[PDB]
Amino acid sequence: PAPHGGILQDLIARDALKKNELLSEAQSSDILVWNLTPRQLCDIELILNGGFSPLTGFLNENDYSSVVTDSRLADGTLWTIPITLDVDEAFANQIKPDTRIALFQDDEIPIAILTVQDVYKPNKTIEAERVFRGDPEHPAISYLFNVAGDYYVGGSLEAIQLPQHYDYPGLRKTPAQLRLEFQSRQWDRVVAFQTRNPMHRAHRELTVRAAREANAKVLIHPVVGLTKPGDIDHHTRVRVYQEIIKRYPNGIAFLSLLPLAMRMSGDREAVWHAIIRKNYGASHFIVGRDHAGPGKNSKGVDFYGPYDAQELVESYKHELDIEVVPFRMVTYLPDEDRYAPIDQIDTTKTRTLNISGTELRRRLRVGGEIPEWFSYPEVVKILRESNPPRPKQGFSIVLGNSLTVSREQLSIALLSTFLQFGGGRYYKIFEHNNKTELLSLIQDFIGSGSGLIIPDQWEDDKDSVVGKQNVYLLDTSSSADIQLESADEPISHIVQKVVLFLEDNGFFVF
Amino acid sequence: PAPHGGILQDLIARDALKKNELLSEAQSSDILVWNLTPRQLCDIELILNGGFSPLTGFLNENDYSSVVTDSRLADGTLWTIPITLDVDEAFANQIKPDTRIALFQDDEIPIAILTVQDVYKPNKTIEAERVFRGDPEHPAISYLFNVAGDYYVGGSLEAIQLPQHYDYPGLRKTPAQLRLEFQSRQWDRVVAFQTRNPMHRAHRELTVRAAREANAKVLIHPVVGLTKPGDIDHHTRVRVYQEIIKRYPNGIAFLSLLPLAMRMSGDREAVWHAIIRKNYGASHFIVGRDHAGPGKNSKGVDFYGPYDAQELVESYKHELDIEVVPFRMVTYLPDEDRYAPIDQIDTTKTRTLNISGTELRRRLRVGGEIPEWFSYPEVVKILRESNPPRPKQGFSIVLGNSLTVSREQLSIALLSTFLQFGGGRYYKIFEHNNKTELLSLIQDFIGSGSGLIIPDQWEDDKDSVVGKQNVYLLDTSSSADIQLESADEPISHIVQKVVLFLEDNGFFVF
Amino acid sequence: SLLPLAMRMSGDREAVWHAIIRKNYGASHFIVGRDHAGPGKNSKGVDFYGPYDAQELVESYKHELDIEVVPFRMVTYLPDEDRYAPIDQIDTTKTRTLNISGTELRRRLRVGGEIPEWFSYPEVVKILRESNPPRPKQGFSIVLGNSLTVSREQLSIALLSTFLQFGGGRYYKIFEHNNKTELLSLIQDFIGSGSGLIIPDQWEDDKDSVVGKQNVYLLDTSSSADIQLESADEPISHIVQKVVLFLEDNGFFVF
Numbered sequence A, B: 001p002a003p004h005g006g007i008l009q010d011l012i013a014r015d016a017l018k019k020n021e022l023l024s025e026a027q028s029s030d031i032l033v034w035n036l037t038p039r040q041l042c043d044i045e046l047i048l049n050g051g052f053s054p055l056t057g058f059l060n061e062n063d064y065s066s067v068v069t070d071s072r073l074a075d076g077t078l079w080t081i082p083i084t085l086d087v088d089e090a091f092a093n094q095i096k097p098d099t100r101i102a103l104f105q106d107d108e109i110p111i112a113i114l115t116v117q118d119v120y121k122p123n124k125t126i127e128a129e130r131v132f133r134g135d136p137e138h139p140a141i142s143y144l145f146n147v148a149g150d151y152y153v154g155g156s157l158e159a160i161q162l163p164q165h166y167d168y169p170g171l172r173k174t175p176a177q178l179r180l181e182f183q184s185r186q187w188d189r190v191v192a193f194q195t196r197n198p199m200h201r202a203h204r205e206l207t208v209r210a211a212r213e214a215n216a217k218v219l220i221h222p223v224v225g226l227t228k229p230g231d232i233d234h235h236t237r238v239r240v241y242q243e244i245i246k247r248y249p250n251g252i253a254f255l256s257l258l259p260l261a262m263r264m265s266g267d268r269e270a271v272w273h274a275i276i277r278k279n280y281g282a283s284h285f286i287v288g289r290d291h292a293g294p295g296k297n298s299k300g301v302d303f304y305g306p307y308d309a310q311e312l313v314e315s316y317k318h319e320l321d322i323e324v325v326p327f328r329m330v331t332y333l334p335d336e337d338r339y340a341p342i343d344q345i346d347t348t349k350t351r352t353l354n355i356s357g358t359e360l361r362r363r364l365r366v367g368g369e370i371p372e373w374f375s376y377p378e379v380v381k382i383l384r385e386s387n388p389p390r391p392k393q394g395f396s397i398v399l400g401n402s403l404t405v406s407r408e409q410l411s412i413a414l415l416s417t418f419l420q421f422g423g424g425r426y427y428k429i430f431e432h433n434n435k436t437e438l439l440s441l442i443q444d445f446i447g448s449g450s451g452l453i454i455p456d457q458w459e460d461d462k463d464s465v466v467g468k469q470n471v472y473l474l475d476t477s478s479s480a481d482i483q484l485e486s487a488d489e490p491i492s493h494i495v496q497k498v499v500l501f502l503e504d505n506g507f508f509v510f
Numbered sequence C: 001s002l003l004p005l006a007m008r009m010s011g012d013r014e015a016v017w018h019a020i021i022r023k024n025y026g027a028s029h030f031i032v033g034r035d036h037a038g039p040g041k042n043s044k045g046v047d048f049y050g051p052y053d054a055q056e057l058v059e060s061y062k063h064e065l066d067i068e069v070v071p072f073r074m075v076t077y078l079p080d081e082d083r084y085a086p087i088d089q090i091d092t093t094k095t096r097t098l099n100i101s102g103t104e105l106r107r108r109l110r111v112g113g114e115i116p117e118w119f120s121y122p123e124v125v126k127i128l129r130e131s132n133p134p135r136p137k138q139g140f141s142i143v144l145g146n147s148l149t150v151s152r153e154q155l156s157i158a159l160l161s162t163f164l165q166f167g168g169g170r171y172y173k174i175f176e177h178n179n180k181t182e183l184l185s186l187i188q189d190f191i192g193s194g195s196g197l198i199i200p201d202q203w204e205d206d207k208d209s210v211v212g213k214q215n216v217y218l219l220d221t222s223s224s225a226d227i228q229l230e231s232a233d234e235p236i237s238h239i240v241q242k243v244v245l246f247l248e249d250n251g252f253f254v255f
């Protein structure tokens, strides 16, 4: 179908004859420079390559308010997710309309020249409730208030180059490239599959089922820009993707990476994804259960209903200009060893089986077996390798403030005790002395599978520098992960307590 | 047998009722304090527990000299390895005879009180020549010159407690404790086996043969104090010993760890080992090929003849009062599927097979297979876990000073590329900013199996702070491990050279 | 010993006959189990004979048969006791039983599914799998219906090349019968050999009886087509995908 709004706004093509000139302006001594954030990098690439057509820059207050309240750009164009350049007061104060700012990547690579239209201070609570449904634990809201600048800068963009990427040079196709790919294959019907998670048997079946339903070739279009915090990394996922694409009949599927930054915005996001897939050359788009939804909040309640996205998308059906292929929960059928949409079964008579993501993380954490029917063996292998079970995981034991015993001796005892277990883990007594340079390496070691014995705590102001993953507190306090009986509990007694705790939590298996 | 010299100088027992008194003195504001070095802790434990009987302290110039030139203490007692307290000029200068110095561990645990007899500056050249045969590459000589203090302090000791060890609490039997272990079992003939390496089929076979010829029970007595630089860590070796002990007929062997600090002084060390094992209650001591030998130097010449230790020990036979059970090279006979001393075969009509330590390291380095005939599987598994193959090993790539491409960009490019491969390894771009607190962490990461991308070299005066294992230089210079064609070579070109270099060396396997 | 008898699958009457035959062959006893010599159920799901009619008929001629009949009620498997036993000696609840019907077995054999160690002997299952191979090892034919308007020569070639890219040891051929019986009769031979036949056009109805319909599928616009076309001129690439996914849905292809 035609790109949204009718014209693929591929600004790299458009501005090809201005590259040299633009390149020089960005590197000039007098121009104002803004280093793009990782989310702004994902967005600008989608803007510059035509993926966000009809967009040609970051939204000004007028288009943004319309998107916020109407799910449309000022001119009525259907657009549900606001794409804005968020900066701080300090930088904002340095600009006015007509100003030309140069946008860089890593303070080295010039990306584009932005021509300012306006500078405004959005009300984040309206944006938070209107676009994302207001729940503070929502990834998009949490980001909006804790990471995004308080000032947005609207303006038109002029391309210099798409953001740099060194992984998968050939796989990140632009809308124009993907289109030639389909074309060279004479693919006039293509159903796209959005995904930010690894694909399992269920996913493979619903995509093939969609291919057969729509008489279309299959496009696996995974997101490799930002997704939901805690997701399985994109490198591990590409490997899972490149592995599962081989379980499709030869010549039916095509894999392409999408550097999009999701907002995990359920129904609104699905609408957005469809627009994006149409721009990329798909004629059909899949929207399954809880599409782009972030699950449930700490209180156990749904951010979106399991089929809100399908409903919202269904309502814009006639103006989307891309065919939506909906699916109800596809589940496994033990008694028939096959997969099928829950809306075509049940009513009792047939038993169904499902393994939730929570159940999988857990199987991966304990080293438990994962059913041959659930996923493909080689996919499970790739997942176990990058998300190793507890006995292969790193961890840190932090000697609390309350300790009265010898910190030097308690550390040595823990180090020697741990070293006698063996099993390939590397241990170290780690002194951070409250230095950020050091504090920030803690999670690197844990990520490497190492066990760190930490002699004393870091001051509270520094706490934010350290991830708390697999970091455990030894102390007399009630908030200690490993609770001491007394501040001066003898060393041997403490070592046993720590050893058995680490074993109870699977770090040690004898 | 009776302890060497007639009396088991068990100073922990001798001074039991002086413990509280010696502790008080040791903690007085007035007393001069010296913090024991690691080798000294090894030596002090053997002196304090009677393993070094008749020694009751560190040698005075008189005994030291005798030993160096005469392989005997001044009173004639056979003794081949000098055991001295080496300190620096600053400390030595505060010492005066008849003074009482407190010897501590980790600057906190009081170990003993030393009553000084003299302070002297030994001629380290004579000691290296007479005791260790003069080759500067000999571990004992390298230690003597680069680590040991330049001043010796002779004096008698009063025990407060043996050095602290939190690993293997019940396995470090003191001479008095082992002697009790033997008695409780009615063992009156015990042949001891010394070792600082993992044990394989050959070792099991020779120890059993020794048991049979001598009609004695078996004492596996491995060294867990200092051994040769580059040996398999003692924690790993202990697991190996604990596994192999199970391959002996039930009730024939006993395992006891020896906190000895070897000097790798072949023949002289052999005699010393005999005296030590006699002190620990053994009636027989095995002396195999190149006993306590460090092998060959740079030019490929031998530090000792493969049977010098046997010859020396034989020449002191009537003095030792412990029966030496000698063994010629024990090897494998493929065609008969059994091990045997080489002196009782060959005839150039019998095929023999052997795998040198070098061949083994290598098989472990590449993840090669190890013959079930060479070693027991459980033993090999333990060895691979602690010394894993290249695809599971860590490494660092250092962007050389010569490089004129963007260090920031080359770094990210290498990171993104490695991440594409997956396989578990954790990667980090590591900036040391020439701070040793950071530089000293590089080998911990390599030790943790991680891959480090270091954007620039550290000062030449910091090299010592950084290990050399799996650290590669990316540069235009001849000294580069991965040589660039020019300092401005394009990033993608550099990335390929690096990736293929690591593959060639096994870190990556596709 | 092998018996070259031609059964009539005549339940109770047949059992009587079998007994007479076994007595003639020298047996002193003859077994008559559940649904002995019965042909199961008809298309309407109803029994041709009752599960124990044969036992009953045989019991009634007991005194003149002059051969001892050893009857058996349904012998089934006991999970909880890992043993087999006549259903008349168990149940009443208390003990759970397991059985795999012939229908269930044919199906396990057709999909390549596993068959319980307790059900049959491994070496017996092996022999059965080898002669009744699962779908990915089975032959089949795709017949280009009369209604097709696209190029039959081109549609056939496209299917042949598509199938050939999957591999897995199957042999394919464009097969022209030109309505000849000599040819039409070889169709099931190829299928029996595991081959995939692309058939350019249908054979006239009078000849249909010459061809077994086993694994023979019809591509056409009709409602009676196994693989139903959207239109008579649906483009080739679209048709190929439809046929490929159908063959996969039915297990002939497994990726």
Ligand SMILES: Nc1ncnc2c1ncn2[C@@H]1O[C@H](COP(=O)(O)OS(=O)(=O)O)[C@@H](O)[C@H]1O
Pocket (backbone or CB within 6 Å): A194, A195, A196, A197, A198, A202, A203, A206, A286, A287, A288, A289, A290, A291, A292, A293, A327, A328, A329, A330, A331
């Ligand atoms: N079991 C399932 N049944 C139906 N749809 C599913 C199922 N699992 C995933 N999907 C769909 O697969 C697509 C991508 O799935 P995910 O990667 O888990 O999440 S999402 O954020 O990209 O939507 C979505 O359209 C989603 O609704």
Ligand SMILES: Nc1ncnc2c1ncn2[C@@H]1O[C@H](COP(=O)(O)OS(=O)(=O)O)[C@@H](O)[C@H]1O
Pocket (backbone or CB within 6 Å): B194, B195, B196, B197, B198, B202, B206, B286, B287, B288, B289, B290, B291, B292, B293, B327, B328, B329, B330, B331
């Ligand atoms: N293959 C062998 N044949 C004979 N003796 C051996 C053999 N291997 C090792 N030994 C002996 O086993 C004892 C300990 O071996 P190692 O741990 O390798 O080295 S040592 O430094 O303690 O001597 C020594 O007596 C040594 O000479």
Ligand SMILES: Nc1ncnc2c1ncn2[C@@H]1O[C@H](COP(=O)(O)OS(=O)(=O)O)[C@@H](O)[C@H]1O
Pocket (backbone or CB within 6 Å): C031, C032, C033, C034, C035, C036, C037, C038, C072, C073, C074, C075, C076
């Ligand atoms: N599970 C069973 N329980 C009792 N009898 C059985 C069972 N299975 C087969 N039989 C008996 O085994 C004999 C031959 O079985 P089949 O080969 O299946 O069929 S038959 O046509 O020759 O009778 C018959 O006497 C039949 O009733």
Ligand SMILES: [Ca+2]
Pocket (backbone or CB within 6 Å): A145, A149, A150
């Ligand atoms: Ca703010």
Ligand SMILES: [Ca+2]
Pocket (backbone or CB within 6 Å): A302, A306
């Ligand atoms: Ca719900």
Ligand SMILES: [Ca+2]
Pocket (backbone or CB within 6 Å): A486, A488
């Ligand atoms: Ca207390």
Ligand SMILES: [Ca+2]
Pocket (backbone or CB within 6 Å): B145, B149, B150
């Ligand atoms: Ca010196």
Ligand SMILES: [Ca+2]
Pocket (backbone or CB within 6 Å): B302, B306
């Ligand atoms: Ca030699």
Ligand SMILES: [Ca+2]
Pocket (backbone or CB within 6 Å): B486, B488
């Ligand atoms: Ca150049």
Ligand SMILES: [Ca+2]
Pocket (backbone or CB within 6 Å): C047, C051
């Ligand atoms: Ca019935």
Ligand SMILES: [Ca+2]
Pocket (backbone or CB within 6 Å): C231, C233
């Ligand atoms: Ca038509």
Ligand SMILES: [Mg+2]
Pocket (backbone or CB within 6 Å): A045, A162, A163, A164, A165, A172
């Ligand atoms: Mg890019």
Ligand SMILES: [Mg+2]
Pocket (backbone or CB within 6 Å): B045, B162, B163, B164, B165, B172, B259
């Ligand atoms: Mg000790």
Ligand code: NA
Pocket (backbone or CB within 6 Å): A001, A002, A321
């Ligand atoms: Na259109």
Ligand code: NA
Pocket (backbone or CB within 6 Å): A106, A107, A108, B408
């Ligand atoms: Na920089």
Ligand code: NA
Pocket (backbone or CB within 6 Å): A304, A305, A308
């Ligand atoms: Na709803």
